[PDB]
Amino acid sequence: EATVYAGTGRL
Amino acid sequence: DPILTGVAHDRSEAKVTIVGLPDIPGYAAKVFRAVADADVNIDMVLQNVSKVEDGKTDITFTCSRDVGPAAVEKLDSLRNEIGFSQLLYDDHIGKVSLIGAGMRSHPGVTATFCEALAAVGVNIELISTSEIRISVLCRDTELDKAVVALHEAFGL
Amino acid sequence: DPILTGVAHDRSEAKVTIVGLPDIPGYAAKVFRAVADADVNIDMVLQNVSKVEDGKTDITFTCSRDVGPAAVEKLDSLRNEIGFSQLLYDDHIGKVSLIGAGMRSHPGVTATFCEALAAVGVNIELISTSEIRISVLCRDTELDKAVVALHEAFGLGG
Ligand SMILES: C[C@@H](O)[C@H](N)C(=O)O
Ligand SMILES: C[C@@H](O)[C@H](N)C(=O)O
């Protein structure tokens, strides 16, 4: 499972 | 009653979450040795309990935004060894803290802290406390209003 | 270098976990106001992040074993006000902490702490750290061996 870059409120 | 000296805020950190770490011995060791090997200074570590349904839990730590990517890269390189399912990285967090002493005998303080943030619509992403500090992470764009709310709620 | 002053341990506490709380403003407030209303003092408080899959997280706190059931019943009585899905209670925990200073610039300290417990087969249930303390909970029957391992790893308790 790919790393989630969170916090941006974006795709 | 408790003493409250101030409110602290920090916009320089990121949070790294290791999702689905096996809840058996030695796994936090693998995570933190990796982070230390990467030369990544750690501010806060938080791990809550597994639930029996999956026998796994998450570990989150915060570090400076400048070194978060190095931590992610290092953990990612050890996916087989460590056995986690996913990494989450969030470099858009603010850390806000109520500073003081003698808070354990006053559960109303933690409640008031959370009520103050709720009333201004700040979502508490994570909570960690000690004898001398109640710390939460929130969106960095919510940090200022969280600070103002705590100032007002505690006369600081 | 980090300054490490002691290893403390406590077998007087229980852990209460509020499971499945919506990760939305106002929910932690309801939990802690209920606990405050019951006049239950709380020691450790920990909440990690939700993930998108359910939008929920858990809140754990510790308190004295004597008042643990009062905290549980108060929360249970408000389970539909608050909206969590379940309460977990564990009155068989040991708490062990490494106490010191200057630990932020020394991630090897946190690694060492965990490696010491791993070496003696102690499972780490929960972790909460700061630049002046590393605290974990383990099964109370594992506390003693955890303490000894930490004494040896950090050259404390002579
Ligand atoms: C889960 C709980 O912390 C919630 N996010 C709140 O802000 O109340
Ligand atoms: C999840 C992690 O803390 C594991 N229980 C360990 O002891 O390493």
Return the CATH number at B124. 3.30.70.260
- Do the chains contact at A5 and B85, CB–CB below 8 Å? no
Q: Where does residue B111 rank: exposed (0-12), middle (13-18), buried (19+ CB within 10 A)?
A: buried
User: Which chains border B (3 or more CB–CB pairs < 8 Å)?
Assistant: A, C
Return the closest-CA partner of residue C95 out of C10, C18, C1: C10
For residues B147 and B98, state if they share a domain.
yes
For residues B61 and B82, state if they share a domain.
yes
Residues 6+ apart with CB under 8 A from C43: B104, C13, C61, C62, C63, C95
C59 CB neighbours in chain B (<8 A) are: 127
For residues B69 and B23, state if they share a domain.
yes
Of residues B86, B89, B92, nearest to A1 (C-beta): B86
Integer Cα distance of B134 and B7 in angstroms: 10
Split into its structural domains, chain B has a count of 2
| C17-51 burial: b if 16+ Cβ within 10 Å, else e | bbbbbbbebbbbbbbbbbbbebebbbbbbbbbbbb
Range of the domain at C36: 12-91
Nearest ligand to the CA atom of C22: 1
For residues B77 and B104, state if they share a domain.
no
For residues C76 and C100, state if they share a domain.
no
Of residues C32, C48, C121, nearest to B111 (C-beta): C32
Interface test with B, best of C78, C128, C131, C133 (most B CBs within 10 A): C128
For residues C78 and C131, state if they share a domain.
no
Residue ranges for the known binding site of B for substrate are 23, 41-43, 47, 109-110, 123-124, 130-131
Residues 6+ apart with CB under 8 A from C144: none
For residues C83 and C97, state if they share a domain.
no
The DSSP symbol for B104 reads: T
For residues B122 and B76, state if they share a domain.
no
Identify how the structure was determined: X-ray
Please report which residue ranges of C120-156 form alpha helices under DSSP H. 143-154
Nearest ligand to the CA atom of B111: 1
Ligand 2, closest atom to CA C123?
A: 7
Integer Cα distance of B143 and B82 in angstroms: 34
Q: Where is the domain boundary, B91, B120, B140?
A: B91
Resolution expressed in Å: 1.6
- Do the chains contact at C25 and B110, CB–CB below 8 Å? no
- Do the chains contact at C51 and B117, CB–CB below 8 Å? no
Pairing of strands B3-10, C86-90: unpaired
Nearest CA to ligand 2 atom 1: B23
For residues C153 and C108, state if they share a domain.
yes
Q: Where is the domain boundary, B47, B62, B91?
A: B91
Of residues A1, A2, A6, nearest to B90 (C-beta): A6
Chains B and C form CB pairs within 8 A to the count of: 166
For residues C18 and C84, state if they share a domain.
yes
Angle at B2 between CA B13 and CA C87, to 5 degrees: 70
Nearest Cα residue in chain A from B125 = A7
For residues B110 and B125, state if they share a domain.
yes
Nearest CA to ligand 1 atom 1: C23
Q: At what angle do helices B27-37 and B68-76 cross, to 10 degrees?
A: 130
For residues C103 and C139, state if they share a domain.
yes
Residues 6+ apart with CB under 8 A from B138: B93, B94, B96, B117, B122, B123, B124, B125, B146
Q: Where is the domain boundary, C72, C91, C110?
A: C91
A6 CB neighbours in chain B (<8 A) are: 88-90, 92
C109 Cα distance to chain centroid: 19
Tokens coding C2: 């980090």
Return the closest-CA partner of residue B58 out of C47, C22, C137, C131: C47
